[PDB]
Design a protein around this nucleic acid. Structure first.
Lengths: 53, 98, 171, 104, 65, 141, 141
RNA sequence: AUUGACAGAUUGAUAGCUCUUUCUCGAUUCCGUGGGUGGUGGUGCAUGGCCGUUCUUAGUUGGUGGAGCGAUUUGUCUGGUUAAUUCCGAUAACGAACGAGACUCUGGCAUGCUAACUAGUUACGCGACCCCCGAGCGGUCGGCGUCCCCCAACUUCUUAGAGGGACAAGUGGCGUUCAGCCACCCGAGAUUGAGCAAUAACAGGUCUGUGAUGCCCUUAGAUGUCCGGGGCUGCACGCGCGCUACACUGACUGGCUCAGCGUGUGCCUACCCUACGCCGGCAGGCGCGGGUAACCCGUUGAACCCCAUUCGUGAUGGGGAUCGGGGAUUGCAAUUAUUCCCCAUGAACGAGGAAUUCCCAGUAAGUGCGGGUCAUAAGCUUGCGUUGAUUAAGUCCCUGCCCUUUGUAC
C-alpha cells in the first residue's frame, strides 16, 4: 500500500514528462516548454515560434 | 454508491456545485487540484467520473492529459436522487446573460 | 503571488496555453463548426473569442454550453471567478476558413457519402465562397485495403515562398 | 504629485508594438509633459532547433524555430489618471504593457 | 553570367512604356520613382529591377522602333 | 571652439574608434602608445599610416583611440583603419579638401583597406557538418 | 609617466625584484610544494614565483580595479589537457590568489573596496608607478 | 454479502503476500454473461500525420484548337541566351496554372533621420576625489580608477526602428547590334548565406511521439501496473562516425592580451545563474550579497595566438592508454571503476597498405566558448565567434544528373 509509488521520482527522465503526449523522451525543456519534440513541431506555430532561418 | 463514502459524496457535491468538473490524467495526486478537504485524490474523482459516464450521467472530453466532464440533465437527476436534494437545487447554469 | 516570471518564459507559456485551448476547442466543438480562438488579456479580465459557424449550437440552450466551457476553462488554467469570458462570434465567409471546411468534409465522410462526391461538393463550396483557388486531399484506404489518395484541385494555388504563410489558409 | 512613471511595451510582433508606442507618444504630446523617447531594447531570439524527423532514420535534417521578442520602454513625468487614460487606449494586439510607478 | 530578367519584369516595363512613354527618360533614378508613382509595385527590389529594364527599352526606342 | 573628430575602423567585430583633437600628436590606443598594443609583429601595421604620411601631417593632431571586440589581429587592423580615417576626417573638416585628397591618395595606393572596411564576416555553420561548407564524413559501405 | 607607458613584461620583472628587496610580503609555507592550478603538469621553474605573481596581481589591480579572488582565478586561467579527451578552460588556484591578495593587503599596496573585491591603494600606486618611471629611464631602447 | 488488518513463522521487504489470531467501510463485494479497459504487444506490406528520398536539378500540368482508329502527341520548339522550361525568337497553335524567379530572414553601406540612467556616456566641464599617482624646482601636461548626479552636450561607438541604398544603371567591347556575355569606372558589381519550395512517386522510415488509428493478440497466476535486483556497458573477433597523438612551425613554466551567439532561480512538481569574503594544495566547504535580466553574473578579462622558459631529436620533458592508493561532490543508492581532484604507473603510436571522405572566401583547417540532453554531464550534437591558407574559376575522363535524336526481344 504505502510502497506503491514509493520510489524517488524527484529528478531524471522518470519524473519529467511531456504536457501533451506524456511520453518521456525528447522533451524540449528549454523555456519551460516541457513537451515532446514531435509535439513541439506539431504545435510550434500556435506557440509563436516560426521558421525564418 | 461505492468506496469511501466521504470522498465519493464530496466529489458528487463538487460536480453539482459547478456544472462541469475536470481532473488531470495522473493517478498519483494525494490532494487533487481544487477540492482538497482531506486527501480525496485524483482517482476516486477520476474513477467516479468514469463510472458516471458508463451509466450515462456525465459526458467527456480529454485534451492534453486532462479530462473535461460536462454534466447531463439525466445525470443531474441521478445526482439529486443520490444526494436526496430539493427540486429547486440550482446546479450552476443559472447565470444572468444580459 | 509575487512571481513575475521571465519575459522569455512568459511569452512561451502564453502561446502554450493558447495552443492547448485551441486543441480542446477543436476536440469539443468539432461537429459544432469551430473556426479558431482569438484570445486577449485585459485589466482583471481575459476575453476569449470563439469563432464558429453554428453559433446557436456553441452557446447551447438559453445560455448553457458557453457557461460550462467558461467554468471548465476557469477550473483548468487557474483563473479566478470572473477573470475570463467566452464570446462566440459568427465567422464571416465560412467557406474561406480551411479548418471549418475540413471539418465539414470529415462530417460528410462519417455520415457515409461517397469519398469523391462529398469532397467535390466541399471544393465547389469553397470556390463559390470566393477563393483564389484550392487544393483538397483525401488520403488513406479509399476502397479495397491498399492505401491510395484523392487529390481534388482547382484554380490559383501556391506552395513556395514566404507568401504561403498568409496567402493560403491550411488545414 | 508628478512622478517618473515608466511604461514598458513588450511583444512578439514588431509592427503592432511600434504602432502602440507611437500612439502612447501622441497621447503624451496631447496631454503635454515629457517623454524620453521609446527605448528600443536589444531584441532576444528564443530559438529551438529540433530534428524534422520523428524517429531517427531519414537524412538528418533540422528545423530552426525562432521566436523574436521586443521591448520598447517609455519614461513619463505625470500623475496616474493621465497614464490610465493613455494605457487603456492601444490594446487588442499581443502587446504586453507593464507600468512601473517610480525609479524601480 | 546570371541576371536575366523574368517575364514579370519584362511585361511590366513594356506595359509601363506603352502607357507612360512621355514620363520616362534615360536617367534611371528619375524613372525609378516614376515606376513607384504610376504602378503599385509591391516590393522595392522588383520596382528597382523594372525601372532598370524600362531604362533599357527607352534606349532601344531612342534608336528605331 | 575645439576641433573634435570621432572616427571608427572595423574588421570582423573590432570597433576601433580613433578620436582626433587639436594637440601635439601623441597617438595612443586605449591608454598606451603605438610601441606596445603587443601582437608586435604587427607593429608596422598600426604604424603604417604615420610612416606613409610622416609626422608632419599628424604633428598638430593628438589621437586617442579606443577598441573593443574582435581578436588581436582584427583590433590592429581596426585601429590602423580608424586613425587614418580619423586623420582624413579631420583634414576634411578643419583644414582643406585638396590636402585631404592628397592624404587619401597616398593611403589608397599603399592599401585601400586603410579607409574602406572589409565586408567579410564569419559565415554561419549549417547542420550536417562541423562548419559552414565542410560536411561530416560519409560512410557509404 | 604612468605604468601603461611601459612594456608590461619588463615591468613585472622590476616589480618582482622590488617586492624581493622589500622583503615583507608573506610568502606562505607551501610555495615549494604547490601545483599553482589544476591545469598544470608541473610547478613553476622560477623558484621565487610568489613575488612574480604578486607583482602581476598588483599591476592587474592598477589597470582594472574591484578584482576579487574569483576574478583573479579567471585571469590566471588557461588550457586543461584532458589528455585523450579535448581541452577546456580551468580557473587558476583560488588559495594562491587569496594569499597573494592578503599579502598585498599587509604591505598596504591594496585594500578591500566597497561593493566587494580588491583595489590597489595610493601607497600601492606609489610603488607601481615609481618603478614604471625607473623602467622608462633605463635606456632608449 | 464478505472491501480493508500490529503479531510472530515466512519474506528481499517494516509486500496484512500467506499460516496464525483480533476485528472492520457497512452496501463496498465475489460469480457469470454481455462487455469493457489497458498494453514501449504484433502488424509501417491495414492506414493517418510527419519526415526522408527519387531530385536540388528544371521540371510538371490541364482548357480550347490542330495531328492520329487509338495508346498518345502538339502546346512544353530548329537556333541563341540564362543559374533556371530564364529570356529573345521561331511557330497548329492560342491563351493559362504550379515550380524557378519574385518572396521572408540574414550579411555587409549609411558622421542621414528617430532614440535613450537597463547603451555609450562622448568628448567636454574636469566640479572633482585622490595620494606624489607620475613627468617635472613648481606650473602645465600623461594616465586611468572612478565619486558623480542632473538643473552638463550629444549620438561618432550602442541598441533597433522606418527610410534610403545596386539596377546590370554607367563607359568600352563582343553578341542578329534582341535576349544577353565580357571587361572597367563609380562604388557592396547581377552572385553573402539560409528559409520556403511543384507534379508524380517509394508498397523508404516511423504503430517505441501522441487520449492519430483498423484488425489481430493479451487481459488477474496479466504482455495492465508498481516495487527490489539485474541487464541494455557482458568480449576469440569484423565494420562505421569520433576524440587524442605521433612533437622542437614543438612541450613545459611564467608573463602579456583580444570574442561572439547565448543561457539563468523563485517552474507542470523542486529546484537556477552566480559576484564578493574567509577555510581547504586540489576537487571542494562555509558565510553573506546581486539577478525573472541591455540592470546581477559580466569591460562575459576564452582559447589558439603573442612574449620571456627550460628541454634537445633520445618512444625524449612527445604521447597519455592501462592500472595501484588516497581525497571531493551529485545522489535514496555509484561496486561492473557516475563525475571531479590528487599522487603514483607510463602501453601502442616515429604520419599510416589497398581504399576512400570533405571542401573554393572569412571558406578549409586550427582554436576555444555557448545551447541541447543535464540531480550528476560531453570524445556527440547544434550555434557562436577568434586565427586564417594552398589551389580552381575549368571539364565531362570517372561518378551521377537534365534535355534532344536514336536503337531496344526491358
Amino acid at each position: 500500500q504505502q510502497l506503491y509509488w514509493s520510489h524517488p521520482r524527484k529528478f531524471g527522465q522518470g519524473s519529467r514528462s511531456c504536457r501533451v503526449c506524456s511520453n518521456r523522451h525528447g522533451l524540449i525543456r528549454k523555456y519551460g516548454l516541457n513537451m515532446c519534440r514531435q509535439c513541439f513541431r506539431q504545435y510550434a506555430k500556435d506557440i509563436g515560434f516560426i521558421k525564418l532561418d | 454508491m461505492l468506496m469511501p463514502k466521504k470522498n465519493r459524496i464530496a466529489i458528487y457535491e463538487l460536480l453539482f456545485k459547478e456544472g462541469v468538473m475536470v481532473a488531470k490524467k495522473d493517478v498519483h495526486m494525494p490532494k487533487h487540484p481544487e477540492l482538497a478537504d482531506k486527501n480525496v485524490p485524483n482517482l476516486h474523482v477520476m474513477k467516479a467520473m468514469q463510472s458516471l459516464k458508463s451509466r450515462g450521467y456525465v459526458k467527456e472530453q480529454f485534451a492534453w492529459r486532462h479530462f473535461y466532464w460536462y454534466l447531463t440533465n439525466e445525470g443531474i437527476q441521478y445526482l439529486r436522487d443520490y444526494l436526496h436534494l430539493p427540486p429547486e437545487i440550482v446546479p450552476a447554469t443559472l447565470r444572468r446573460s444580459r | 503571488m509575487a512571481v513575475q516570471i521571465s519575459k522569455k518564459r512568459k511569452f512561451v507559456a502564453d502561446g502554450i496555453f493558447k495552443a492547448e485551448l485551441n486543441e480542446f476547442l477543436t476536440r469539443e466543438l468539432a461537429e459544432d463548426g469551430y473556426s479558431g480562438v482569438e484570445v486577449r488579456v485585459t485589466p482583471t479580465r481575459t476575453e476569449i473569442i470563439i469563432l464558429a459557424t453554428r453559433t446557436q449550437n456553441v452557446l447551447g440552450e438559453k445560455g448553457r454550453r458557453i457557461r460550462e466551457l467558461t467554468a471548465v476553462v476557469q477550473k483548468r488554467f487557474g483563473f479566478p471567478e470572473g477573470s475570463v469570458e467566452l464570446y462566440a462570434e459568427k465567422v464571416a465567409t465560412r467557406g474561406l476558413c480551411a479548418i471549418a471546411q475540413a471539418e465539414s468534409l470529415r462530417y460528410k465522410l462519417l455520415g457515409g457519402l461517397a469519398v469523391r462526391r462529398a469532397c467535390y461538393g466541399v471544393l465547389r463550396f469553397i470556390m463559390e465562397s470566393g477563393a483564389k483557388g484550392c487544393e483538397v486531399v483525401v488520403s488513406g484506404k479509399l476502397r479495397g485495403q491498399r492505401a491510395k489518395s484523392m487529390k481534388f484541385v482547382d484554380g490559383l494555388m501556391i506552395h513556395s515562398g514566404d507568401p504561403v504563410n498568409y496567402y493560403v489558409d491550411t488545414a | 504629485a508628478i512622478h517618473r512613471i515608466r511604461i514598458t511595451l513588450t511583444s512578439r510582433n514588431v509592427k503592432s508594438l511600434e504602432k502602440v508606442c507611437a500612439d502612447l507618444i501622441r497621447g503624451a504630446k496631447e496631454k503635454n509633459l515629457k517623454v524620453k523617447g521609446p527605448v528600443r531594447m536589444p531584441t532576444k531570439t528564443l530559438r529551438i532547433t529540433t530534428r524534422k524527423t520523428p524517429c531517427g532514420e531519414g537524412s538528418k535534417t533540422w528545423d530552426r524555430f525562432q521566436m523574436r521578442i521586443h521591448k520598447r520602454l517609455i519614461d513619463l513625468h505625470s500623475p496616474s489618471e493621465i497614464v490610465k487614460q493613455i494605457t487603456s487606449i492601444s490594446i487588442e494586439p499581443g502587446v504586453e504593457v507593464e507600468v512601473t510607478i517610480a525609479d524601480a | 553570367m546570371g541576371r536575366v530578367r523574368t517575364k514579370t519584369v519584362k511585361k511590366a516595363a513594356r506595359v509601363i512604356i506603352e502607357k507612360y512613354y512621355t514620363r520616362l527618360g534615360n536617367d534611371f533614378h528619375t524613372n525609378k520613382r516614376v515606376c513607384e508613382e504610376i504602378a503599385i509595385i509591391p516590393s522595392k527590389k522588383l520596382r528597382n529591377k523594372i525601372a532598370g529594364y524600362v531604362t533599357h527599352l527607352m534606349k532601344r526606342i531612342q534608336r528605331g522602333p | 571652439p575645439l576641433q573634435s573628430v570621432q572616427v571608427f575602423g572595423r574588421k570582423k567585430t573590432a570597433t576601433a574608434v580613433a578620436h582626433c583633437k587639436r594637440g601635439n600628436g601623441l597617438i595612443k590606443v586605449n591608454g598606451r602608445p603605438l610601441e606596445m598594443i603587443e601582437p608586435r609583429t604587427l607593429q608596422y601595421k598600426l604604424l603604417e599610416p604615420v610612416l606613409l604620411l610622416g609626422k608632419e601631417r599628424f604633428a598638430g593632431v593628438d589621437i586617442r583611440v579606443r577598441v573593443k571586440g574582435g581578436g588581436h589581429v582584427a583590433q590592429i587592423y581596426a585601429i590602423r583603419q580608424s586613425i587614418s580615417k580619423a586623420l582624413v576626417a579631420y583634414y576634411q573638416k578643419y583644414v582643406d579638401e585638396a590636402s585631404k585628397k592628397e592624404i587619401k591618395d597616398i593611403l589608397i595606393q599603399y592599401d585601400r583597406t586603410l579607409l574602406v572596411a572589409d565586408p567579410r564576416r564569419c559565415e554561419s555553420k549549417k547542420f550536417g557538418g562541423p562548419g559552414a561548407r565542410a560536411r561530416y564524413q560519409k560512410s557509404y559501405r | 609617466v604612468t605604468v601603461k607607458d611601459v612594456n608590461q613584461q619588463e615591468f613585472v620583472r622590476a616589480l618582482a625584484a622590488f617586492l624581493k628587496k622589500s622583503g615583507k610580503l608573506k610568502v606562505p609555507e607551501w610555495v615549494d610544494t604547490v601545483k599553482l592550478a589544476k591545469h598544470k603538469e608541473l610547478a613553476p621553474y622560477d623558484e621565487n614565483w610568489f613575488y612574480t605573481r604578486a607583482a602581476s596581481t598588483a599591476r592587474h589591480l592598477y589597470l582594472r580595479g574591484g578584482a576579487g579572488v574569483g576574478s583573479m582565478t579567471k585571469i590566471y586561467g588557461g588550457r586543461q589537457r584532458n589528455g585523450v579527451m579535448p581541452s577546456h578552460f580551468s580557473r587558476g588556484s583560488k588559495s594562491v590568489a587569496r594569499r597573494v591578495l592578503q599579502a598585498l593587503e599587509g604591505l598596504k599596496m591594496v585594500e578591500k573596496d566597497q561593493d566587494g573585491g580588491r583595489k590597489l591603494t595610493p601607497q600601492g600606486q606609489r610603488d607601481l608607478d615609481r618603478i614604471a618611471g625607473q623602467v622608462a629611464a633605463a635606456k632608449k631602447k
